[PDB]
């Protein structure tokens, strides 16, 4: 299947408390693999996945220098945007960027992206053509115009089509035992009493990779998507994921409800019920 390289970047000002906090967190698919954090004791890019041990010192030096340069750019940006929006120096503000690319199973580019937010709202984004920008407001229109005059989209496109895909391919090769693995969900159902002669049934799916999964509850062959509570699929601390989904049903009738689990590591989807 397809694969992605994504960097989540955050710059947050702290007026009165020194320089902004600056972080870059890199993912291949759903797995964290590198990080830079300006608040660390000795700020440098660090491996976050075991297979990144395969890069030499020159990798960590270059990425570190690039991160430190980016940190300085974002510091400047925070001050620039205060001017664009006519805001005071006393308040904290946040810039966010998601930057990366996706390739097909053949390693060829499917999609590139670069999206910016300010204080949690859309600011500017590269369009899917990899040639033009969309600006969400008049401040971002200033940025768009600078980037047009500097040829920024062409520089960015060269990264997305070149560097980004080439490094993604390399990370997938080096990390193949981790990244191309499948860990099958293990499921179970729990049962909780309620007032009013009703009962919560909760279907759990544990230990799975990759993160994409579907959990449904059925009564008499029909999915109950409207009545279900669930959590977003969530990391479990060791590179796997988990999820649950619950439904509220009449006491005495729990035998008629079935949880269904669909995942890459389940040749046939799991069907299960509460086990008294």
């Amino acid at each position: 299947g397809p694969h992605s390289l994504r960097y989540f970047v955050t710059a947050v000002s702290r007026p009165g408390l020194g320089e902004p906090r600056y972080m870059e967190v890199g993912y291949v698919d759903d797995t964290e693999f590198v990080r830079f954090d300006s608040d660390a004791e000795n700020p440098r890019y660090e491996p976050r996945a075991r297979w990144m041990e395969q890069e030499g010192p020159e990798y960590w030096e270059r990425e570190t220098q690039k991160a430190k340069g980016n940190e300085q750019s974002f510091r400047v940006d925070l001050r620039t945007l205060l001017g664009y929006y006519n805001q005071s120096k006393g308040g904290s503000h946040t810039i966010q960027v998601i930057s990366g690319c996706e390739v097909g199973s053949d390693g060829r580019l499917l999609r590139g992206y670069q999206q910016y937010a300010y204080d949690g709202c859309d600011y500017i984004a590269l369009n899917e053509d990899l040639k033009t920008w969309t600006a969400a407001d008049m401040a971002a229109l200033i940025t768009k115009h600078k980037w047009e005059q500097a040829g920024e989209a062409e520089r960015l496109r060269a990264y997305l089509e070149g560097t980004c895909v080439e490094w993604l391919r390399r990370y997938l090769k080096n990390g193949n035992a981790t990244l191309l693995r499948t860990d099958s969900p293990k499921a179970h159902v729990t049962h909780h009493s309620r007032p009013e002669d009703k009962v919560t049934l909760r279907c759990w799916a544990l230990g799975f990779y990759p993160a994409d999964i579907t959990l449904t509850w059925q009564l008499n062959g029909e999915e109950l998507i409207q009545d279900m509570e669930l959590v977003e699929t969530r990391p479990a601390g060791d590179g796997t994921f988990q999820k649950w989904a619950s439904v509220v049903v009449p006491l005495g009738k729990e035998q008629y409800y079935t949880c269904h689990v669909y995942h890459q590591g389940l040749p046939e989807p799991l069907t299960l019920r509460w086990e008294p």
Binding site: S73, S99, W147
Partner: peptide
């Protein structure tokens, strides 16, 4: 792997 970002 990471891009060198432009100022805004």
């Amino acid at each position: 792997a990471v891009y060198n970002f432009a100022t805004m």
